[PDB]
Amino acid sequence: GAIAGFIENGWEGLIDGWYGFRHQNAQGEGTAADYKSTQSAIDQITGKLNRLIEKTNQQFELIDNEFNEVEKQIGNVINWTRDSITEVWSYNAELLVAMENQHTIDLADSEMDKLYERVKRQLRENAEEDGTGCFEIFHKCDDDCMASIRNNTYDHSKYREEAMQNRIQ
Amino acid sequence: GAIAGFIENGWEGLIDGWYGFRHQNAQGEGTAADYKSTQSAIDQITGKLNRLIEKTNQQFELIDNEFNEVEKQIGNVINWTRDSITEVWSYNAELLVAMENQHTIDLADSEMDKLYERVKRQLRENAEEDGTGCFEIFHKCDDDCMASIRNNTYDHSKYREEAMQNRIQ
Amino acid sequence: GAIAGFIENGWEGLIDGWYGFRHQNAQGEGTAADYKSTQSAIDQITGKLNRLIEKTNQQFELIDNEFNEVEKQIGNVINWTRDSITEVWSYNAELLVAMENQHTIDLADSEMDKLYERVKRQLRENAEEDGTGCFEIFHKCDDDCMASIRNNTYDHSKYREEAMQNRIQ
Amino acid sequence: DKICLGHHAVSNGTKVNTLTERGVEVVNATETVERTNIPRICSKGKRTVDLGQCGLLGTITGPPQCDQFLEFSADLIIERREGSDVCYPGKFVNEEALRQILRESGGIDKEAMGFTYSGIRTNGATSACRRSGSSFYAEMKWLLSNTDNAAFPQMTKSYKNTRKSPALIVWGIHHSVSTAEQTKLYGSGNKLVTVGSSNYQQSFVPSPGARPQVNGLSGRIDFHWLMLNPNDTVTFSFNGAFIAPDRASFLRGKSMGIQSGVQVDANCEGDCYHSGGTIISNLPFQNIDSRAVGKCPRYVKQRSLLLATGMKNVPEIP
Amino acid sequence: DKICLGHHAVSNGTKVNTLTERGVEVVNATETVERTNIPRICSKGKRTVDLGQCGLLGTITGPPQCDQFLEFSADLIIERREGSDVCYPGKFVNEEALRQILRESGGIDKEAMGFTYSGIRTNGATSACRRSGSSFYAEMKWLLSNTDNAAFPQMTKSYKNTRKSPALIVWGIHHSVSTAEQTKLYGSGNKLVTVGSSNYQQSFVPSPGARPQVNGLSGRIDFHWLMLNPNDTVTFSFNGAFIAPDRASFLRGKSMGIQSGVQVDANCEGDCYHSGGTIISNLPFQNIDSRAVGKCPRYVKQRSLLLATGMKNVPEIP
Amino acid sequence: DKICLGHHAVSNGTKVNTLTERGVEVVNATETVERTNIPRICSKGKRTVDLGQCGLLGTITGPPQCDQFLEFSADLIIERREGSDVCYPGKFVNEEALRQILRESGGIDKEAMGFTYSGIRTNGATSACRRSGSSFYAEMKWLLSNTDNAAFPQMTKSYKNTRKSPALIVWGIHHSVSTAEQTKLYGSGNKLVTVGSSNYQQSFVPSPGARPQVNGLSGRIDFHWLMLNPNDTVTFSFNGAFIAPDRASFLRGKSMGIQSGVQVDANCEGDCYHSGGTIISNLPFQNIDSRAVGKCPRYVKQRSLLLATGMKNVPEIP
Numbered sequence A, B, C: 001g002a003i004a005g006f007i008e009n010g011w012e013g014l015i016d017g018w019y020g021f022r023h024q025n026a027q028g029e030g031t032a033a034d035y036k037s038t039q040s041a042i043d044q045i046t047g048k049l050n051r052l053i054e055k056t057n058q059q060f061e062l063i064d065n066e067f068n069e070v071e072k073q074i075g076n077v078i079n080w081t082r083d084s085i086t087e088v089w090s091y092n093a094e095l096l097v098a099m100e101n102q103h104t105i106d107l108a109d110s111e112m113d114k115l116y117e118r119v120k121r122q123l124r125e126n127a128e129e130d131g132t133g134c135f136e137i138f139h140k141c142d143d144d145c146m147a148s149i150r151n152n153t154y155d156h157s158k159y160r161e162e163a164m165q166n167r168i169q
Numbered sequence D, E, F: 001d002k003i004c005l006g007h008h009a010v011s012n013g014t015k016v017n018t019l020t021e022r023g024v025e026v027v028n029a030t031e032t033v034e035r036t037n038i039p040r041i042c043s044k045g046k047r048t049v050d051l052g053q054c055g056l057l058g059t060i061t062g063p064p065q066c067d068q069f070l071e072f073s074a075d076l077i078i079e080r081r082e083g084s085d086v087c088y089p090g091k092f093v094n095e096e097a098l099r100q101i102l103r104e105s106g107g108i109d110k111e112a113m114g115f116t117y118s119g120i121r122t123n124g125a126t127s128a129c130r131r132s133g134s135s136f137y138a139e140m141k142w143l144l145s146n147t148d149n150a151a152f153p154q155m156t157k158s159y160k161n162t163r164k165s166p167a168l169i170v171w172g173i174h175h176s177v178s179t180a181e182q183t184k185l186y187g188s189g190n191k192l193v194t195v196g197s198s199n200y201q202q203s204f205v206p207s208p209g210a211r212p213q214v215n216g217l218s219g220r221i222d223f224h225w226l227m228l229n230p231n232d233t234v235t236f237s238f239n240g241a242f243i244a245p246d247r248a249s250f251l252r253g254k255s256m257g258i259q260s261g262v263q264v265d266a267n268c269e270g271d272c273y274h275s276g277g278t279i280i281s282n283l284p285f286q287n288i289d290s291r292a293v294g295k296c297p298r299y300v301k302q303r304s305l306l307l308a309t310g311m312k313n314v315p316e317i318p
């Protein structure tokens, strides 16, 4: 009945946010989403979308004819030019998407690390990493204490004595 | 009268470098720039600039005429081709700048983390993170001690006894 | 006769992998490659190569003539178009390679950090960073113990008493 | 007591491509390449003319098919495959360039050129231009000799464009089925037509000869055109085989022309067209038609390029 | 006791470029720009014809150089610099467009057009088309008057394309060295040739006059061509100076044409060609020839663009 | 005791764009799109000719406006809007192609072609080419009959290019205002001009007829040109209405031509030009003129694309 965080597995139960908290104490188990990390990721992804929606004001008109085919030579030049340009945009499109997707994935991983590192700095010397993305808290942490961690109102000074004791022996 | 590091705020007083140190001890408060981290960032940014200055040896000549307009058909083909090419370069330019700027920002953030992590490894078990980008030093650190940290001559072995004592109780 | 890890220097002796372990204990010194980190990097680099091998199905045919030169005007239009397109691909090629290389280097650095951070989480409170990419292990770690670290079978609970003792005094 | 940091995940993962991986699953993705076509010409907001059987160049010369469009006005012009520029068999020289001009003209305004004739018939008509009975191009005059085989007098007609926009001028050269027919219409001897401007100079001779029957006719009329600058003048010198203009054309404003084989729709609002319909999309790329015109997403070869809109999908350890 | 994490490194480091650095060393790299050329035309798997001294357009008209290729079939067509379309001095109108058509034709199939003549010589021959003795273009007929200076009767010949593919039709206009020579061959008076189709109309007059001697001859024949649609008909009306076709041409299928000056090789398998040989490469770019044709890597200005296939090289501290 | 790690920041932050954000502030940025134009033609280091009233094609034929430039030499050639290729009204066939050739010629070297005439006037002059008195194109000869209405003898003149560079040859066809004027100058009957080379063959007939008065004249001369290969020969056969060349032209070397309406400056050093001046910039892009020529930064639609030269700006918590 153990719980685990990021590092081999996501949470299919976290359905109200992208990033979140999962605790277990005497009160049982719980899961809640972190707003600030979730919104940062959402704002960045939607930011990409808007950039890719920015339409062009360039209008293009017919340069050949599909009812009455133009002269061969000028027609082959045109086809050659269009096909050359289509190759360029096909290349651009492929690269743009691959590039953005790599970045989307990386910045998402970044937000996860930043959330983990923040919590680590909140807990100071009162906790230890279990290596699955969790923190073993070396003091009693009820639901109110867990909530204090989620909204950054956790004062490590309050539990430090009790925690260092349990850690050292 | 508290001081804070990166993580919600930069320093508008750090005017001799990009990255730096800010301490407070019995001697008071001080701020100094780190050279190696600053130069690495500057060398990388200037490296981008040089790459974007590398001029083309391709010469182009007139293909139409703005005094005596060329024939309609060949003229429309030319306009269509140029406008198609302008769309391509406008796209390239927009993407290049957006991409480079994202990278410039990220590598700058990277240098900040690397500097923070270095200092953390210097201080070993003699300090703790306050969560604002600072380190609480659990021993007496005068100006000479602070300077030793900045030029990487800080020997944690010297203060370890005193520090572990103050940390543990 | 000290050993050091990444952070100022790679290992020219690590010839069976990209990333690896180097230890020293009473049994002496040893070096072994980590598979999972090495393969991840290799799979990603080879993944890039395959993407750049994906051939085009676009066939192009002759549009001018190098035995019997075409008419001047249409010939200059064609040359102008081809040279314009060559500039575009030369640009694309230069940027693609520079971009991929920057990413190749960064993801390789990433794998190194991830390996270091993993080991750090294995050792828990039984070791300290020396700042050269190594861990000072505060208990006796023979070859079997070293091997347990490399295949992630190291149980920090087994050595914790002995380690915390040696660390604290 | 324990607190874990995590991220969401699904079993409903969709594959995308990156620099390194091919088919890496992300939590969510969206398409960037439009493939959804609307098989109509969405014309709402645009003054639209469907030429139907009228060929675009016919609007200038005026075969019976184009009588409604002799002075048409539009923002959106639609050519149809069934369209024909011609009643009496023939074709324009530099036709496509002229089409490209008319497609963005915004329609045409016609103005009389004021040519008067003496010692000559102007009522040249044909069975191929049936309008009630036998007729001819509405904007043109088929000039003959007077009786039959009689000599066609040398003539010189000029027209000045007194307007501020360039004038579109069109004339025809008639190629009879035989030198016998050419003589019957314009008299014996060689025939010459010279057209002079102040930036244009061309010349024309007819070529009588047997040709395959088109519309039952083996004769051909080939049309020629120029743009006349303001206050400039065109002069016509000729002695037969000349199809004279009655009116000149002036471009109204701005428009866009397309070729299509689907119906029109004045409810839909669109701005990117192709022969198969309208592309309405905010997507940057499309895979519908490489020759689409208007304000369009760029055409690409690929039918699908998925953009990750979510993080990498990592299934929960069960 | 100590455990260190590290990465491999070499002294054999190779420099590459990034967004920031220029010449940053990585452990391993590979080239992306192909420069390795195979100076042969790798033709394995492709039915190949090396026209040699036969010019491509000559395959249609048939100078002696092209007698082997009058109905050639190929997947790969190779023009040579020594090739000539002509025996009797002259040139095609719109030659390059015709070349581009034949390069992808897959070869040509010839079919008789069935023209019969009366009151006229058809045995026009020249020393410039030596085939055993004096001769002429194999697919064409040099029509004369009958005796010398005699009048050339007006004639009209037509041909319908009863096939499902368009027919390639070629005719010639003969320009004599003098009006004296033109009269000796076709009789006095002006000469006219009219060519009529159902989407084509052109006319021709000869231009007698002195010209520089080419192949010992000061006369010129210029060839003209059209594509005839299925069930459509071409009609020829003429009275001299006309070089008539005997057979029409039909395109076989699909091919690709190149211009080269290197040998052919039927062992090598290739798909990207240039005048200097074959480019076989999986690399995305090449710096060999900007005009290379077929399925090719994109041409770039740079001779080398190294792609890092390994991490940044960091030498061990000794 | 405490030590903090930080980074600099300003209140003077400038906004840039990234993949994600639009208007994210960085500490410092620089422009990549050049908009700063120098309204002069910076010519330092370049041998420059300002044709002024001389049209570029006029340098070959030689109206009075171009007498200084008949054998000009330049690295940089500047056409002006006021320039005219012509004194006696007319125009070149394939004019633009010829312009593009002369723009990179490096200037022209003239050489006599050595034509001699008998039984004919060569002193054809006009009021439109006033040079002291009535005159004509300096490089050309206006050939007449001899007296008035007299017959123009058939003539044949040839010229071999004995040099190693191709020769630029130009001739004119004269179109009289009437057949009465054509007869008065060259005699009755049809007139023919044939021009033969060893890779070129064309023919010409005049077209007498009324045309609008240009420079007070209703006649037109249209010029034609070819490039003559080394050791090749051009031959002219004609009997009237022919404007003969006196000298041929040879291209000097290499140059670049522009069209401009701003002054010249020999102090500034530039390499990218447009009609409005010079672009001197190390920036990769520019938004000044899409048709700029020379060695230029690429033209883009956007007026500004800011490149971050510093980190993200994060204001200090006060």
Ligand SMILES: CC(=O)N[C@@H]1[C@@H](O)[C@H](O[C@@H]2O[C@H](CO)[C@H](O)[C@H](O[C@]3(C(=O)O)C[C@H](O)[C@@H](NC(C)=O)[C@H]([C@H](O)[C@H](O)CO)O3)[C@H]2O)[C@@H](COS(=O)(=O)O)O[C@H]1O
Pocket (backbone or CB within 6 Å): D123, D124, D125, D126, D127, D128, D134, D142, D144, D176, D177, D181, D185, D216, D217, D218, D219, D220
């Ligand atoms: C195939 C068949 O069974 N019969 C066709 C006829 O359709 C057609 O007959 C007529 O032939 C006479 C002379 O051969 C005329 O060409 C006539 O053409 C008209 C016309 O009706 O449109 C007669 C007009 O009155 C003429 N108008 C003027 C101003 O001259 C005019 C003129 O004759 C020619 O069109 C000028 O090219 O048109 C035919 O209806 C005949 C076709 O005539 S043609 O060979 O194309 O010249 O051919 C029969 O075989």
Ligand SMILES: CC(=O)N[C@@H]1[C@@H](O)[C@H](O[C@@H]2O[C@H](CO)[C@H](O)[C@H](O[C@]3(C(=O)O)C[C@H](O)[C@@H](NC(C)=O)[C@H]([C@H](O)[C@H](O)CO)O3)[C@H]2O)[C@@H](COS(=O)(=O)O)O[C@H]1O
Pocket (backbone or CB within 6 Å): E123, E124, E125, E126, E127, E128, E134, E142, E144, E176, E177, E181, E185, E216, E217, E218, E219, E220
């Ligand atoms: C430079 C020199 O020393 N001698 C050359 C000769 O090579 C050449 O002599 C012949 O001249 C007569 C009339 O001047 C013929 O043109 C003849 O041309 C033939 C031919 O042999 O190919 C004769 C054929 O029987 C003709 N066939 C028909 C159907 O007419 C034909 C015809 O005469 C012309 O080719 C039509 O253009 O070809 C020459 O071999 C002479 C070259 O003749 S030309 O000036 O090019 O017309 O020039 C001498 O100076």
Ligand SMILES: CC(=O)N[C@@H]1[C@@H](O)[C@H](O[C@@H]2O[C@H](CO)[C@H](O)[C@H](O[C@]3(C(=O)O)C[C@H](O)[C@@H](NC(C)=O)[C@H]([C@H](O)[C@H](O)CO)O3)[C@H]2O)[C@@H](COS(=O)(=O)O)O[C@H]1O
Pocket (backbone or CB within 6 Å): F123, F124, F125, F126, F127, F128, F134, F142, F144, F176, F177, F181, F185, F216, F217, F218, F219, F220
């Ligand atoms: C509008 C008006 O009030 N008067 C104009 C006159 O400007 C002009 O008068 C002259 O007309 C005669 C015949 O009508 C000549 O064309 C003459 O043209 C010259 C010339 O001066 O340039 C006379 C030369 O001596 C001729 N040289 C040769 C070699 O023939 C030459 C020749 O006549 C024509 O230029 C060939 O086209 O040029 C005029 O100055 C007259 C314009 O003449 S035209 O209609 O353009 O032919 O028109 C009056 O109405």
Ligand SMILES: *[C@@H]1O[C@H](CO)[C@@H](O[C@@H]2O[C@H](CO)[C@@H](O[C@@H]3O[C@H](CO)[C@@H](O)[C@H](O)[C@@H]3O)[C@H](O)[C@H]2NC(C)=O)[C@H](O)[C@H]1NC(C)=O
Pocket (backbone or CB within 6 Å): D028, D029, D030, D309
């Ligand atoms: C998976 O990704 C897609 C694509 O981003 C998400 O669908 C998107 O949902 C948003 C809001 O639900 C849509 O925004 C809309 O904007 C229009 C125009 O301003 C407005 O009229 C709508 O009321 C709405 O606010 C967006 O268009 C839509 N995109 C697509 C392609 O449908 C989807 O939510 C993602 N899935 C999950 C589970 O997050």
Ligand SMILES: *[C@@H]1O[C@H](CO)[C@@H](O[C@@H]2O[C@H](CO)[C@@H](O[C@@H]3O[C@H](CO)[C@@H](O)[C@H](O)[C@@H]3O)[C@H](O)[C@H]2NC(C)=O)[C@H](O)[C@H]1NC(C)=O
Pocket (backbone or CB within 6 Å): E028, E029, E030, E309
């Ligand atoms: C330095 O980088 C180069 C480039 O990646 C490495 O050379 C590459 O080695 C692999 C395997 O040794 C080659 O893969 C091959 O694929 C072909 C086609 O499927 C197959 O027939 C071969 O048997 C082989 O599996 C790859 O082609 C080759 N690339 C080049 C350009 O030679 C090289 O190994 C790297 N150096 C080090 C020390 O890792």
Ligand SMILES: *[C@@H]1O[C@H](CO)[C@@H](O[C@@H]2O[C@H](CO)[C@@H](O[C@@H]3O[C@H](CO)[C@@H](O)[C@H](O)[C@@H]3O)[C@H](O)[C@H]2NC(C)=O)[C@H](O)[C@H]1NC(C)=O
Pocket (backbone or CB within 6 Å): F028, F029, F030, F309
């Ligand atoms: C904000 O960014 C701009 C752009 O990089 C910085 O201005 C730049 O300053 C450097 C040195 O001050 C200039 O380098 C110069 O190179 C030329 C050519 O080699 C040389 O002749 C000069 O003596 C100088 O060394 C660079 O051109 C200049 N760039 C621009 C666009 O003016 C600026 O310093 C940055 N602001 C801050 C506060 O760092």
Ligand SMILES: *[C@@H]1O[C@H](CO)[C@@H](O)[C@H](O)[C@H]1NC(C)=O
Pocket (backbone or CB within 6 Å): A069, A070, A071, A072, A073, A074, A075, A076, A079
């Ligand atoms: C241009 O491409 C279209 C579509 O592939 C083709 O139908 C047309 O024949 C081409 N034009 C010429 C002149 O071959």
Ligand SMILES: *[C@@H]1O[C@H](CO)[C@@H](O)[C@H](O)[C@H]1NC(C)=O
Pocket (backbone or CB within 6 Å): B069, B070, B071, B072, B073, B074, B075, B076, B079
């Ligand atoms: C090409 O574009 C220019 C600038 O927009 C325009 O003035 C010119 O008319 C165009 N050419 C043709 C043939 O329409």
Ligand SMILES: *[C@@H]1O[C@H](CO)[C@@H](O)[C@H](O)[C@H]1NC(C)=O
Pocket (backbone or CB within 6 Å): C069, C070, C071, C072, C073, C074, C075, C076, C079
């Ligand atoms: C096109 O470029 C080739 C190679 O630079 C050159 O040989 C040729 O002359 C150019 N075409 C024209 C019409 O100038």
Ligand SMILES: *[C@@H]1O[C@H](CO)[C@@H](O)[C@H](O)[C@H]1NC(C)=O
Pocket (backbone or CB within 6 Å): D231
């Ligand atoms: C208009 O044309 C007349 C002659 O037709 C000419 O004299 C005048 O200069 C032209 N321009 C104006 C503005 O009148």
Ligand SMILES: *[C@@H]1O[C@H](CO)[C@@H](O)[C@H](O)[C@H]1NC(C)=O
Pocket (backbone or CB within 6 Å): E231
């Ligand atoms: C074929 O040509 C004849 C006349 O030559 C014409 O009547 C017929 O409509 C054409 N088409 C078919 C399918 O027969």
Ligand SMILES: *[C@@H]1O[C@H](CO)[C@@H](O)[C@H](O)[C@H]1NC(C)=O
Pocket (backbone or CB within 6 Å): F231
């Ligand atoms: C030069 O021309 C003559 C005849 O005009 C010709 O015989 C010769 O082969 C040509 N070439 C050389 C190098 O003399």
